[PDB]
Design a protein around this ligand. Structure first.
Ligand SMILES: CO[C@H]1CC2=CC(=O)O[C@H](C2)[C@H](C)[C@@H](OC)C[C@H](OC)/C=C/[C@H](C)[C@@H](OC)C[C@@H](OC)/C=C/[C@H](C)[C@@H]([C@@H](C)[C@@H](OC)[C@@H](C)CCC(=O)[C@H](C)[C@@H](CCC(=O)O)OC)OC(=O)/C=C/C=C(\C)C1
Ligand SMILES: Nc1ncnc2c1ncn2[C@@H]1O[C@H](COP(=O)(O)OP(=O)(O)OP(=O)(O)O)[C@@H](O)[C@H]1O
Ligand SMILES: [Ca+2]
Ligand SMILES: [Ca+2]
Length: 361
């Protein structure tokens, strides 16, 4: 045999076995060292954070710390999945526009450190598209650290048209802390950040129209929701519920001058060959945890419709599984009969070295 699928994100690792419906292990992408054992990984590092210095080896989707990434992978195999990686083909994921040296190092580590019999690296957005049951479309993938638009045709990403936006879930969490503090609460500490992340994931939503929603919130309590803090205090969340994710559509709310996600989607489509643009408009797939806000699909449909030609058929696909669709795509790909010739084998590695990844992946 059974292949392993490891989707390594800025915030969370999603890992499991090809053929499972969902990842067995989902844990924070963190390694902590004493300010016992020599290091801790994942939730244990999080729970023991008070006595550790934490490192986050994936930044904006890119692996930036190889010693700590090795610790994350080792923890995934040995602790979380209870597998010997030398016994399983292993499929890893990577960010769009991942540098060649980076994919080489991933490959080197899998074969030399973990002794895998075979491996493959796939682009996260491409896997998400596969999970949606198609090979052509444009993915908006938004996680904890980065957002990308990735147009894909007949299974392959179109690098010249990929858009990267360094605004994602962590920025939204921080903004929600800020605006709840402005309301008169105080959310400033590291523990309070975790609480506000929960508030964000439970109560936020994307308004179909920002102004209408602000007006409703100003003139009634109909949008207000209660939230109980760990210690039992009950607070009220009002327009913050939709003001937080509104930032995706209007990054200026946090002082970023970037185009919002509807505009980046349009701009990415317009970088592609005119002949495939209708295929992209008709197959906008949302992926990643920061696309989980209720209302986001209807809002994207509205905004893209306003930008596109009047005759254009537009469809937003926002699967309920989209927190884990990258992982699911890896699972179905690794399981597919026609994929089995595509693995990089140990022999292929021994006879080419790490740069085999550019040819095979
Ligand atoms: C219940 O499990 C679903 C959950 C799910 C997750 C998600 O993110 O999206 C939703 C479903 C979808 C939006 C969905 O919702 C209900 C609607 C989707 O509508 C088209 C229906 C999907 C069905 C599950 C699927 O039935 C198995 C429909 C089927 O239609 C004929 C589609 C088959 C596709 C051909 C297939 C391919 C895209 C993948 O094949 C496994 C893909 C890995 C192929 C990759 C290539 O061809 C690469 C170009 C080549 C090189 C790289 O790989 C060798 O695509 C599939 O077989 C996709 C299967 C997906 C699942 C089994 C996941
Ligand atoms: N229901 C929800 N509503 C809003 N945000 C959510 C929801 N569920 C999870 N998130 C957010 O999604 C992010 C995690 O998503 P994901 O696992 O896709 O990111 P990642 O792969 O770790 O990061 P990246 O793709 O940026 O490298 C977090 O910021 C989390 O708070
Ligand atoms: Ca991700
Ligand atoms: Ca702006």
């Amino acid at each position: 045999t059974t292949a392993l699928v490891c989707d390594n994100g800025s915030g969370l690792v999603k890992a499991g076995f090809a053929g499972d419906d969902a990842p067995r292990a989902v844990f924070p992408s963190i390694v902590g060292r004493p300010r016992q054992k020599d290091s801790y990984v994942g939730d244990e590092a999080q729970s023991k954070r008070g006595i550790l210095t934490l490192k986050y080896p994936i930044e904006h989707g890119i692996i930036t710390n190889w010693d700590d990434m090795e610790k994350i992978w080792h923890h995934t195999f040995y602790n979380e999945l209870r597998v010997a990686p030398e016994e399983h083909p292993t499929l890893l994921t990577e960010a769009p526009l991942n540098p060649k040296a980076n994919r080489e190092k991933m490959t080197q580590i899998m074969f030399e450190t973990f002794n895998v019999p075979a491996m493959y690296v796939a682009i996260q957005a491409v896997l998400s598209l596969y999970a949606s049951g198609r090979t052509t479309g444009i993915v908006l993938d938004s996680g904890d650290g980065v957002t990308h638009n990735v147009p894909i045709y007949e299974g392959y990403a179109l690098p010249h048209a990929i858009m990267r936006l360094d605004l994602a879930g962590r920025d939204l969490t921080d903004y929600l802390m800020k605006i709840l503090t402005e309301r008169g609460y105080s959310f400033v500490t590291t523990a309070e950040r975790e609480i506000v992340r929960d508030i964000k994931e439970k109560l936020c939503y994307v308004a179909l129209d920002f102004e209408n929603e602000m007006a409703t919130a100003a003139s009634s309590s109909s949008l207000e929701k209660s939230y109980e803090l760990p210690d039992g205090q009950v607070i009220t969340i009002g327009n913050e519920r939709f003001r937080c994710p509104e930032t995706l559509f209007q990054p200026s709310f946090i002082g970023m001058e970037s185009a919002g996600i509807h505009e980046t989607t349009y701009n990415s489509i317009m970088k592609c060959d005119i002949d495939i643009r209708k295929d992209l408009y008709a197959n906008n797939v949302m992926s990643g945890g920061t696309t989980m806000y209720p209302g986001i699909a209807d809002r994207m449909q509205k905004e893209i419709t306003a930008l596109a030609p009047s005759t254009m058929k537009i469809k937003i696909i926002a699967p309920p599984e989209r927190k884990y669709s990258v992982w699911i795509g890896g699972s179905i790909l690794a399981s597919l009969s026609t994929f089995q010739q595509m693995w990089i084998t140990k022999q292929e590695y021994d006879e080419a070295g790490p740069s085999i990844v550019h040819r095979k992946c």
